[PDB]
Design a binder for this molecule. Structure first.
Ligand SMILES: [Mn+2]
Ligand SMILES: [Mn+2]
Ligand SMILES: [Mn+2]
Ligand SMILES: [Mn+2]
Lengths: 130, 131
């Protein structure tokens, strides 16, 4: 689920940032109410992603790491092709849940393509001028 | 404009282009929804002046419809070009098309042109995929 993925992504980031994740911090991070959070935490607990402060299971840590990687990759991709920095976060937040792993992997190869030769970025920039 | 509303406009535009007209029953079939749901959305589109309730698109509806079909086709071409398995392309495009700003669409447009103007670039991309 897209929303469930947003939660796991955020929880993982808080644990890496503060060392733990409070219901209050999750609520403010997703701009939602603490009641909503608690309801999701129960489902995640039952699905074995975390125990409940709240601790992630090996399963939750694996998925969390993957989601943060996916988010970071997509921001890097949009940045490389020249998207206005101010529009990147909201676009990534919207598309990240609707891309298959096959698409993410191919975008990964695309980012690598442009990173291995700066002349390629200049050629892309040229077309943007025209 | 909402994502589902965009899905309706895109579909109506294509039916008019393919069959010459858009019936409520054909829209229901294409989106796999009940006709009541379609009728409700069509009244909202009528209210926002995208069409007149057969179904006739206004200049505003034709403009947006054309734009949405363009966006769908561009994104399919983009995923195809970078090597995504053909069977997964439609589903990915249907989901992301609504969440990309025009700025992103324009830049993806330049990217597609980039690979399309020199086959050598496509070969280099495929080479990395082999690493
Ligand atoms: Mn994200
Ligand atoms: Mn998101
Ligand atoms: Mn579409
Ligand atoms: Mn769609």
């Amino acid at each position: 689920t897209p929303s469930m993925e947003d939660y796991i992504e955020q929880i993982y980031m808080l644990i890496e940032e503060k060392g733990y994740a409070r219901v209050s911090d999750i609520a403010e991070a997703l701009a939602v109410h603490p009641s909503s959070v608690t309801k999701m935490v129960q489902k995640l607990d039952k699905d074995e992603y975390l125990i409940y402060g709240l601790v992630l299971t090996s399963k939750g840590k694996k998925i969390g790491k993957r989601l943060v990687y996916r988010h970071e990759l997509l921001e890097q991709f949009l940045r490389i092709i020249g998207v206005d920095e101010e529009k990147i976060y909201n676009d990534v937040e919207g598309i990240e849940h609707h891309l298959s792993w096959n698409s993410i992997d191919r975008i990964g190869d695309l980012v690598q393509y442009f990173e291995e030769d700066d002349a390629r970025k200049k050629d892309l920039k040229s077309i943007q001028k025209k």
